[PDB]
Every structure is written in structure tokens, then in C-alpha cells.
Amino acid sequence: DDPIGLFVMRPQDGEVTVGGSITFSARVAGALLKPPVVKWFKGKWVDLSSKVGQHLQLHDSYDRASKVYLFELHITDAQPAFTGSYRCEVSTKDKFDCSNFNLTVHE
């Protein structure tokens, strides 16, 4: 099957009800002197780090035992406009990867 890129685990499609909360995440193996770096997007160009607040938070962590980096995107009090196409981009010193996923907000 397909070549192994940077994602140990890719972000998945998600569904949430209006007012609900949902987490998206990515895992990357550290094997690397510096942590991989993540960016989350809505559409081609909206950088969600610019959108952090009552409805959106980001959290990055590392598990020493497994040497895996975890990147989380938390959406809270979901609104209908949050529906759509999203993307996770990860960089290391040597590689770049990305992964597309969708959010659907119901009700």
C-alpha cells in the first residue's frame, strides 16, 4: 500500500451537534532534535492558530515512552459555520506532509 509519510495517525473526518465539542488530532514519530511543527487550516488559507479563543484551541504534546508527538485541534460550542474542509500540515527538518479532513456540524 501507500508510502509512509509523517503521519503515524492522520486526522479523521468528524461529526458534532451544534453546541457540542470535538477533537481532531495527528501523531508523528519523533525518532529528531526538534519537535515536528504543526499548522491547522480551514480551506486553503485560513490558519487556525489565528482563530484560537472560545471555540478553538490547540495543544501539542510528546509521549516519551513511545517517542510520538501528538497535535490536537479542539473545537468547542460548535456552530454551523464550522462545517467544511480542513487540513493538517506537519514539518520536520527534512520533510513536509499534510492531511485533509472534514467537519460536519449537525442541527
Side-chain angles (χ1 to χ4, degrees), residues 65-102:
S66 64
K67 303 175 291 175
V68 174
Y69 290 91
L70 176 62
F71 304 99
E72 296 173 283
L73 165 67
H74 303 118
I75 299 167
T76 49
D77 186 22
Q79 300 300 308
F82 299 170
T83 291
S85 162
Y86 290 76
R87 183 174 71 265
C88 183
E89 301 188 353
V90 178
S91 310
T92 63
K93 183 200 185 193
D94 302 301
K95 285 179 180 183
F96 179 81
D97 206 352
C98 73
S99 208
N100 279 267
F101 63 104
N102 296 270

mmCIF file of all heavy atoms in Angstrom, residues 65-102:
data_model
loop_
_atom_site.group_PDB
_atom_site.id
_atom_site.type_symbol
_atom_site.label_atom_id
_atom_site.label_comp_id
_atom_site.label_asym_id
_atom_site.label_seq_id
_atom_site.Cartn_x
_atom_site.Cartn_y
_atom_site.Cartn_z
ATOM 1 N N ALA A 65 7.785 7.592 26.247
ATOM 2 C CA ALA A 65 7.904 6.135 26.081
ATOM 3 C C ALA A 65 7.797 5.656 24.634
ATOM 4 O O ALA A 65 8.539 4.779 24.186
ATOM 5 C CB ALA A 65 6.848 5.405 26.915
ATOM 6 N N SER A 66 6.843 6.226 23.902
ATOM 7 C CA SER A 66 6.624 5.806 22.523
ATOM 8 C C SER A 66 7.391 6.675 21.536
ATOM 9 O O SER A 66 7.476 6.290 20.371
ATOM 10 C CB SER A 66 5.129 5.802 22.191
ATOM 11 O OG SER A 66 4.568 7.103 22.250
ATOM 12 N N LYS A 67 7.931 7.798 21.983
ATOM 13 C CA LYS A 67 8.559 8.821 21.137
ATOM 14 C C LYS A 67 7.618 9.344 20.065
ATOM 15 O O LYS A 67 7.997 9.565 18.908
ATOM 16 C CB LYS A 67 9.842 8.307 20.456
ATOM 17 C CG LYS A 67 10.821 7.809 21.513
ATOM 18 C CD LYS A 67 12.040 7.183 20.863
ATOM 19 C CE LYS A 67 11.705 5.873 20.153
ATOM 20 N NZ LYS A 67 12.856 5.295 19.405
ATOM 21 N N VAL A 68 6.355 9.563 20.411
ATOM 22 C CA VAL A 68 5.337 10.075 19.496
ATOM 23 C C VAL A 68 4.887 11.477 19.911
ATOM 24 O O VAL A 68 4.577 11.714 21.079
ATOM 25 C CB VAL A 68 4.110 9.149 19.443
ATOM 26 C CG1 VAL A 68 2.995 9.751 18.597
ATOM 27 C CG2 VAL A 68 4.491 7.772 18.916
ATOM 28 N N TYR A 69 4.851 12.342 18.911
ATOM 29 C CA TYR A 69 4.305 13.685 19.081
ATOM 30 C C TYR A 69 2.830 13.720 18.720
ATOM 31 O O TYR A 69 2.462 13.176 17.674
ATOM 32 C CB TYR A 69 5.083 14.692 18.224
ATOM 33 C CG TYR A 69 6.486 14.980 18.658
ATOM 34 C CD1 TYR A 69 7.583 14.265 18.181
ATOM 35 C CD2 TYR A 69 6.658 16.002 19.593
ATOM 36 C CE1 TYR A 69 8.847 14.576 18.628
ATOM 37 C CE2 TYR A 69 7.920 16.319 20.029
ATOM 38 C CZ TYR A 69 8.987 15.599 19.533
ATOM 39 O OH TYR A 69 10.235 15.909 20.012
ATOM 40 N N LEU A 70 2.026 14.309 19.579
ATOM 41 C CA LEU A 70 0.592 14.483 19.395
ATOM 42 C C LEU A 70 0.218 15.946 19.184
ATOM 43 O O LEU A 70 0.681 16.845 19.897
ATOM 44 C CB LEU A 70 -0.149 13.908 20.614
ATOM 45 C CG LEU A 70 -1.671 14.077 20.679
ATOM 46 C CD1 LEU A 70 -2.361 13.358 19.519
ATOM 47 C CD2 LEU A 70 -2.207 13.597 22.026
ATOM 48 N N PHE A 71 -0.600 16.199 18.168
ATOM 49 C CA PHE A 71 -1.039 17.551 17.827
ATOM 50 C C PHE A 71 -2.554 17.501 17.877
ATOM 51 O O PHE A 71 -3.120 16.694 17.149
ATOM 52 C CB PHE A 71 -0.478 17.953 16.465
ATOM 53 C CG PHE A 71 1.006 17.867 16.330
ATOM 54 C CD1 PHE A 71 1.588 16.778 15.729
ATOM 55 C CD2 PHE A 71 1.795 18.900 16.813
ATOM 56 C CE1 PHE A 71 2.968 16.699 15.608
ATOM 57 C CE2 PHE A 71 3.158 18.823 16.689
ATOM 58 C CZ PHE A 71 3.736 17.715 16.099
ATOM 59 N N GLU A 72 -3.157 18.326 18.722
ATOM 60 C CA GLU A 72 -4.610 18.379 18.843
ATOM 61 C C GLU A 72 -5.217 19.731 18.454
ATOM 62 O O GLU A 72 -4.666 20.803 18.718
ATOM 63 C CB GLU A 72 -5.018 18.022 20.273
ATOM 64 C CG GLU A 72 -4.655 16.598 20.672
ATOM 65 C CD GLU A 72 -4.925 16.384 22.159
ATOM 66 O OE1 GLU A 72 -4.095 16.852 22.983
ATOM 67 O OE2 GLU A 72 -5.958 15.764 22.505
ATOM 68 N N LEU A 73 -6.374 19.632 17.816
ATOM 69 C CA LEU A 73 -7.255 20.728 17.487
ATOM 70 C C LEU A 73 -8.590 20.488 18.194
ATOM 71 O O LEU A 73 -9.260 19.483 17.928
ATOM 72 C CB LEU A 73 -7.398 20.836 15.975
ATOM 73 C CG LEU A 73 -8.543 21.700 15.448
ATOM 74 C CD1 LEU A 73 -8.285 23.142 15.784
ATOM 75 C CD2 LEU A 73 -8.655 21.477 13.941
ATOM 76 N N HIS A 74 -8.936 21.395 19.111
ATOM 77 C CA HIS A 74 -10.181 21.259 19.850
ATOM 78 C C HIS A 74 -11.189 22.299 19.380
ATOM 79 O O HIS A 74 -10.884 23.489 19.397
ATOM 80 C CB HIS A 74 -9.959 21.425 21.338
ATOM 81 C CG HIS A 74 -8.966 20.494 21.945
ATOM 82 N ND1 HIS A 74 -7.785 20.736 22.583
ATOM 83 C CD2 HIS A 74 -9.091 19.153 21.974
ATOM 84 C CE1 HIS A 74 -7.212 19.614 22.985
ATOM 85 N NE2 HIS A 74 -8.015 18.630 22.602
ATOM 86 N N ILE A 75 -12.379 21.857 18.991
ATOM 87 C CA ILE A 75 -13.454 22.793 18.631
ATOM 88 C C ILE A 75 -14.518 22.702 19.709
ATOM 89 O O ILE A 75 -14.917 21.612 20.089
ATOM 90 C CB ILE A 75 -13.992 22.451 17.242
ATOM 91 C CG1 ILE A 75 -12.931 22.556 16.150
ATOM 92 C CG2 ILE A 75 -15.217 23.302 16.922
ATOM 93 C CD1 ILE A 75 -13.320 21.944 14.822
ATOM 94 N N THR A 76 -14.941 23.863 20.186
ATOM 95 C CA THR A 76 -15.898 23.872 21.273
ATOM 96 C C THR A 76 -17.097 24.745 20.923
ATOM 97 O O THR A 76 -16.918 25.703 20.172
ATOM 98 C CB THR A 76 -15.194 24.391 22.538
ATOM 99 O OG1 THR A 76 -14.491 25.598 22.235
ATOM 100 C CG2 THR A 76 -14.125 23.414 22.990
ATOM 101 N N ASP A 77 -18.255 24.357 21.466
ATOM 102 C CA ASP A 77 -19.519 25.053 21.259
ATOM 103 C C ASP A 77 -19.719 25.253 19.754
ATOM 104 O O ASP A 77 -19.791 26.369 19.221
ATOM 105 C CB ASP A 77 -19.521 26.377 22.008
ATOM 106 C CG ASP A 77 -20.875 27.053 21.927
ATOM 107 O OD1 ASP A 77 -21.895 26.377 21.680
ATOM 108 O OD2 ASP A 77 -20.897 28.288 22.100
ATOM 109 N N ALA A 78 -19.770 24.120 19.062
ATOM 110 C CA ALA A 78 -19.730 24.120 17.597
ATOM 111 C C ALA A 78 -20.867 24.898 16.960
ATOM 112 O O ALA A 78 -21.999 24.743 17.404
ATOM 113 C CB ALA A 78 -19.776 22.712 16.997
ATOM 114 N N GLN A 79 -20.543 25.684 15.939
ATOM 115 C CA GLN A 79 -21.568 26.438 15.231
ATOM 116 C C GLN A 79 -21.681 25.946 13.781
ATOM 117 O O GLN A 79 -20.743 25.362 13.233
ATOM 118 C CB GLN A 79 -21.266 27.936 15.277
ATOM 119 C CG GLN A 79 -21.194 28.510 16.687
ATOM 120 C CD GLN A 79 -22.508 28.304 17.424
ATOM 121 O OE1 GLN A 79 -23.554 28.676 16.883
ATOM 122 N NE2 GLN A 79 -22.468 27.721 18.617
ATOM 123 N N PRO A 80 -22.811 26.132 13.124
ATOM 124 C CA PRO A 80 -22.977 25.626 11.759
ATOM 125 C C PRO A 80 -21.897 26.064 10.791
ATOM 126 O O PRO A 80 -21.537 25.323 9.885
ATOM 127 C CB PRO A 80 -24.337 26.247 11.336
ATOM 128 C CG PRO A 80 -25.068 26.291 12.637
ATOM 129 C CD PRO A 80 -24.039 26.761 13.638
ATOM 130 N N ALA A 81 -21.396 27.277 10.974
ATOM 131 C CA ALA A 81 -20.384 27.756 10.041
ATOM 132 C C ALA A 81 -19.080 26.967 10.156
ATOM 133 O O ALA A 81 -18.245 27.108 9.259
ATOM 134 C CB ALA A 81 -20.068 29.236 10.255
ATOM 135 N N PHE A 82 -18.926 26.153 11.197
ATOM 136 C CA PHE A 82 -17.632 25.452 11.341
ATOM 137 C C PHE A 82 -17.572 24.277 10.383
ATOM 138 O O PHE A 82 -16.480 23.737 10.149
ATOM 139 C CB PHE A 82 -17.394 25.017 12.778
ATOM 140 C CG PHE A 82 -17.341 26.181 13.753
ATOM 141 C CD1 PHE A 82 -17.334 25.877 15.102
ATOM 142 C CD2 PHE A 82 -17.310 27.514 13.377
ATOM 143 C CE1 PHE A 82 -17.350 26.838 16.083
ATOM 144 C CE2 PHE A 82 -17.328 28.486 14.345
ATOM 145 C CZ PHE A 82 -17.318 28.166 15.700
ATOM 146 N N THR A 83 -18.681 23.875 9.830
ATOM 147 C CA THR A 83 -18.690 22.829 8.828
ATOM 148 C C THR A 83 -17.739 23.156 7.689
ATOM 149 O O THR A 83 -17.662 24.285 7.222
ATOM 150 C CB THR A 83 -20.097 22.624 8.259
ATOM 151 O OG1 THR A 83 -20.870 22.060 9.330
ATOM 152 C CG2 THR A 83 -20.168 21.682 7.064
ATOM 153 N N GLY A 84 -17.027 22.156 7.212
ATOM 154 C CA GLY A 84 -16.275 22.274 5.993
ATOM 155 C C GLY A 84 -15.003 21.428 5.978
ATOM 156 O O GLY A 84 -14.812 20.489 6.748
ATOM 157 N N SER A 85 -14.142 21.809 5.049
ATOM 158 C CA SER A 85 -12.883 21.181 4.676
ATOM 159 C C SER A 85 -11.721 21.745 5.485
ATOM 160 O O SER A 85 -11.536 22.956 5.437
ATOM 161 C CB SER A 85 -12.611 21.421 3.187
ATOM 162 O OG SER A 85 -11.253 21.215 2.812
ATOM 163 N N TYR A 86 -10.927 20.940 6.163
ATOM 164 C CA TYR A 86 -9.813 21.322 6.995
ATOM 165 C C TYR A 86 -8.558 20.567 6.595
ATOM 166 O O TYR A 86 -8.606 19.533 5.888
ATOM 167 C CB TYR A 86 -10.093 20.975 8.484
ATOM 168 C CG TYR A 86 -11.153 21.838 9.134
ATOM 169 C CD1 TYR A 86 -12.503 21.637 8.859
ATOM 170 C CD2 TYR A 86 -10.824 22.847 10.002
ATOM 171 C CE1 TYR A 86 -13.488 22.426 9.442
ATOM 172 C CE2 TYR A 86 -11.800 23.641 10.599
ATOM 173 C CZ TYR A 86 -13.124 23.443 10.318
ATOM 174 O OH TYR A 86 -14.029 24.257 10.946
ATOM 175 N N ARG A 87 -7.404 21.039 7.056
ATOM 176 C CA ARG A 87 -6.140 20.431 6.696
ATOM 177 C C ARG A 87 -5.157 20.546 7.839
ATOM 178 O O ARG A 87 -5.081 21.570 8.501
ATOM 179 C CB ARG A 87 -5.558 21.038 5.389
ATOM 180 C CG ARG A 87 -4.263 20.399 4.896
ATOM 181 C CD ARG A 87 -3.824 20.962 3.521
ATOM 182 N NE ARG A 87 -3.372 22.335 3.707
ATOM 183 C CZ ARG A 87 -4.094 23.423 3.550
ATOM 184 N NH1 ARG A 87 -5.350 23.417 3.117
ATOM 185 N NH2 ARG A 87 -3.524 24.592 3.809
ATOM 186 N N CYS A 88 -4.379 19.490 8.047
ATOM 187 C CA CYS A 88 -3.272 19.469 8.986
ATOM 188 C C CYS A 88 -1.931 19.421 8.246
ATOM 189 O O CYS A 88 -1.853 18.516 7.424
ATOM 190 C CB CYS A 88 -3.398 18.259 9.898
ATOM 191 S SG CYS A 88 -2.145 18.116 11.178
ATOM 192 N N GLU A 89 -1.017 20.343 8.524
ATOM 193 C CA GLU A 89 0.288 20.341 7.869
ATOM 194 C C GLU A 89 1.348 20.128 8.943
ATOM 195 O O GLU A 89 1.273 20.728 9.999
ATOM 196 C CB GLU A 89 0.560 21.661 7.150
ATOM 197 C CG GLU A 89 -0.463 22.005 6.087
ATOM 198 C CD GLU A 89 -0.112 23.216 5.242
ATOM 199 O OE1 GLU A 89 0.888 23.892 5.551
ATOM 200 O OE2 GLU A 89 -0.855 23.476 4.275
ATOM 201 N N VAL A 90 2.297 19.251 8.693
ATOM 202 C CA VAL A 90 3.381 18.987 9.611
ATOM 203 C C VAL A 90 4.707 19.129 8.869
ATOM 204 O O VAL A 90 4.838 18.694 7.736
ATOM 205 C CB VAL A 90 3.293 17.596 10.257
ATOM 206 C CG1 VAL A 90 4.501 17.391 11.167
ATOM 207 C CG2 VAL A 90 1.982 17.450 11.014
ATOM 208 N N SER A 91 5.661 19.747 9.556
ATOM 209 C CA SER A 91 7.022 19.896 9.069
ATOM 210 C C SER A 91 8.046 19.306 10.041
ATOM 211 O O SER A 91 7.860 19.441 11.252
ATOM 212 C CB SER A 91 7.368 21.363 8.790
ATOM 213 O OG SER A 91 6.419 22.063 7.994
ATOM 214 N N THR A 92 9.125 18.718 9.544
ATOM 215 C CA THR A 92 10.304 18.374 10.309
ATOM 216 C C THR A 92 11.489 19.076 9.625
ATOM 217 O O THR A 92 11.324 19.764 8.632
ATOM 218 C CB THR A 92 10.572 16.869 10.398
ATOM 219 O OG1 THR A 92 10.806 16.452 9.052
ATOM 220 C CG2 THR A 92 9.332 16.123 10.899
ATOM 221 N N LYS A 93 12.690 18.889 10.135
ATOM 222 C CA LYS A 93 13.886 19.426 9.486
ATOM 223 C C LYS A 93 14.013 18.914 8.055
ATOM 224 O O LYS A 93 14.606 19.570 7.212
ATOM 225 C CB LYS A 93 15.140 19.027 10.281
ATOM 226 C CG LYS A 93 16.476 19.559 9.802
ATOM 227 C CD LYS A 93 17.630 18.709 10.355
ATOM 228 C CE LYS A 93 18.991 19.268 10.013
ATOM 229 N NZ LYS A 93 20.145 18.358 10.238
ATOM 230 N N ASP A 94 13.437 17.732 7.782
ATOM 231 C CA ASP A 94 13.705 17.120 6.489
ATOM 232 C C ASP A 94 12.490 16.852 5.622
ATOM 233 O O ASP A 94 12.677 16.555 4.450
ATOM 234 C CB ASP A 94 14.455 15.792 6.721
ATOM 235 C CG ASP A 94 15.759 16.005 7.477
ATOM 236 O OD1 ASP A 94 16.624 16.764 6.986
ATOM 237 O OD2 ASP A 94 15.882 15.396 8.569
ATOM 238 N N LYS A 95 11.285 16.959 6.176
ATOM 239 C CA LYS A 95 10.088 16.549 5.467
ATOM 240 C C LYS A 95 8.928 17.496 5.728
ATOM 241 O O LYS A 95 8.905 18.225 6.716
ATOM 242 C CB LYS A 95 9.694 15.117 5.859
ATOM 243 C CG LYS A 95 10.521 14.013 5.270
ATOM 244 C CD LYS A 95 10.119 12.604 5.712
ATOM 245 C CE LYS A 95 11.025 11.555 5.070
ATOM 246 N NZ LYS A 95 10.640 10.166 5.412
ATOM 247 N N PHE A 96 7.968 17.427 4.815
ATOM 248 C CA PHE A 96 6.692 18.125 4.926
ATOM 249 C C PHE A 96 5.551 17.178 4.578
ATOM 250 O O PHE A 96 5.695 16.435 3.613
ATOM 251 C CB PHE A 96 6.658 19.345 4.004
ATOM 252 C CG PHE A 96 5.362 20.123 4.023
ATOM 253 C CD1 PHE A 96 5.104 21.039 5.045
ATOM 254 C CD2 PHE A 96 4.390 19.939 3.059
ATOM 255 C CE1 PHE A 96 3.919 21.748 5.081
ATOM 256 C CE2 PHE A 96 3.226 20.655 3.066
ATOM 257 C CZ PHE A 96 2.993 21.546 4.095
ATOM 258 N N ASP A 97 4.446 17.195 5.302
ATOM 259 C CA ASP A 97 3.340 16.316 4.974
ATOM 260 C C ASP A 97 2.045 17.049 5.291
ATOM 261 O O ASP A 97 2.048 18.018 6.041
ATOM 262 C CB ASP A 97 3.472 14.984 5.704
ATOM 263 C CG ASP A 97 2.773 13.843 4.984
ATOM 264 O OD1 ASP A 97 2.061 14.047 3.997
ATOM 265 O OD2 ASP A 97 2.960 12.730 5.475
ATOM 266 N N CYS A 98 0.952 16.597 4.728
ATOM 267 C CA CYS A 98 -0.339 17.149 5.099
ATOM 268 C C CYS A 98 -1.460 16.114 4.951
ATOM 269 O O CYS A 98 -1.290 15.072 4.341
ATOM 270 C CB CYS A 98 -0.619 18.440 4.365
ATOM 271 S SG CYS A 98 -1.006 18.305 2.647
ATOM 272 N N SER A 99 -2.584 16.465 5.545
ATOM 273 C CA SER A 99 -3.697 15.531 5.611
ATOM 274 C C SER A 99 -5.013 16.281 5.675
ATOM 275 O O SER A 99 -5.154 17.156 6.531
ATOM 276 C CB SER A 99 -3.468 14.674 6.852
ATOM 277 O OG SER A 99 -4.054 13.358 6.719
ATOM 278 N N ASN A 100 -5.931 15.940 4.785
ATOM 279 C CA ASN A 100 -7.215 16.605 4.671
ATOM 280 C C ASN A 100 -8.255 15.865 5.466
ATOM 281 O O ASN A 100 -8.203 14.614 5.566
ATOM 282 C CB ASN A 100 -7.644 16.611 3.189
ATOM 283 C CG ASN A 100 -6.974 17.732 2.396
ATOM 284 O OD1 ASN A 100 -7.542 18.804 2.275
ATOM 285 N ND2 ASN A 100 -5.779 17.520 1.894
ATOM 286 N N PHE A 101 -9.204 16.579 6.014
ATOM 287 C CA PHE A 101 -10.320 16.002 6.749
ATOM 288 C C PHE A 101 -11.495 16.968 6.772
ATOM 289 O O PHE A 101 -11.352 18.152 6.459
ATOM 290 C CB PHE A 101 -9.919 15.641 8.184
ATOM 291 C CG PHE A 101 -9.508 16.798 9.081
ATOM 292 C CD1 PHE A 101 -10.393 17.273 10.050
ATOM 293 C CD2 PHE A 101 -8.259 17.372 8.934
ATOM 294 C CE1 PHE A 101 -10.017 18.307 10.887
ATOM 295 C CE2 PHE A 101 -7.904 18.400 9.774
ATOM 296 C CZ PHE A 101 -8.774 18.873 10.758
ATOM 297 N N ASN A 102 -12.661 16.451 7.143
ATOM 298 C CA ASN A 102 -13.848 17.280 7.164
ATOM 299 C C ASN A 102 -14.538 17.314 8.508
ATOM 300 O O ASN A 102 -14.463 16.355 9.284
ATOM 301 C CB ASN A 102 -14.821 16.740 6.089
ATOM 302 C CG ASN A 102 -14.186 16.912 4.721
ATOM 303 O OD1 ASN A 102 -14.338 17.924 4.058
ATOM 304 N ND2 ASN A 102 -13.433 15.920 4.255
#
